[model samples]
Target: ENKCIAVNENKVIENQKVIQSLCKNSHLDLIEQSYFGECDFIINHSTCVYKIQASRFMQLRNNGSLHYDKAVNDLLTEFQRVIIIVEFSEIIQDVDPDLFWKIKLYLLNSRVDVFFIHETTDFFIDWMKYFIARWAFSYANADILLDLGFNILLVRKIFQTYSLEEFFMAIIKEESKAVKMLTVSQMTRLKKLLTLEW
Candidate 1:
């Protein structure tokens, strides 16, 4: 797992000051290693720590002390609500209560633990779970779903909504600067994934 995944450090560059301040304030012992450098503060700042309703930094702090099962269950509840919001929001407004609960049950049964997953694990974990679900669980084929030949401009205004990974991957592909952990056979698989429509 020590793939030395070169973090999109450029994205974090603009956040250096707030990141440094957070580390300076936090009482935790800072390891001399560069890898252990203060990222939490930078993240909190980027999320507008001053105005955000929930304290991401505090959450990070409290996460270490949470009981495992309790934390996992809380995350599960939140994840189900998010899926409902994203996939079935229209039905909610129309008062389809049963539709809401059905998706909730389906999400619960998937045994998803979106809470405890670390930021470092997000790229790989999300790609596997979210993308696979889009293709396998939700039964979508990307080629047909995305091919907009000429109507792309007409429907493009509706493109604002997509999960974070979806946006990240799209930009990464457009820029030809996609990140990956090179393994023996990973190059071949990655080339296909990058080029193939599906």
Candidate 2:
């Protein structure tokens, strides 16, 4: 699934030298693409690649990928762990049917660590409700889970049917165990869902 090719453009010495150096240091073969105008070198790993628009040339607003299905389409299991960041566009209420189905498919398989980002809290809360309905677990990182006005009710329903122990049993992979680990806020949500007072 991986291969390399070297290209030394006679017209440009500097670009050829840079490509050669990168190929040597990274042990990657350079390929010549006359049509690859400004695109940088492609990483030949088994991982998938998706697009994210930046405000500046090298500026990233956040650590998220935009489209749900596009990201999942590129996902591959070649590496030990896969970190998928989904950054939403400025438009919050786009009403995309594909997004829900893709998220459902992604949740069912559980191959990547997905970080969902949005510009507005209310929209994210509504989106989270849909995600939690399709997703089988309630485990979320502290950053999103502990934020003020975060909707615990959206995720509370999952625990009513499946216990945390069952979640761990299904997520048996060592790489995925850390992903399933519940944060303090998530734990609090679980307790609240169960209506346990101590």
In order, how many clashes per candidate?
0, 5
The prediction achieving the highest lDDT against the true structure is: 2
Cα-based TM-score, every candidate: 0.17, 0.23
Off by over 4 Å in 2: 1-75, 90-94, 97-101, 119-198
How does residue 186 of candidate 2 score in lDDT? Answer: 42
Candidate 2 lDDT tens digits, 1-198: 223422223323434444444444343334443311121222222121122221121233356544333333333322222334344554432645356345434445544555555543454334333432333232234233324222232223224334546543433432344334443444445445446566
Models, CA RMSD each: 19.0, 20.6
Off by over 4 Å in 1: 1-94, 113-198
lDDT of 1 by residue, 61-174 (tens): 345642233433433332221111122233243655454344334336453422222223233334323322232211022232224211121112123343435634654464
- Each model's lDDT comes to 0.27, 0.35
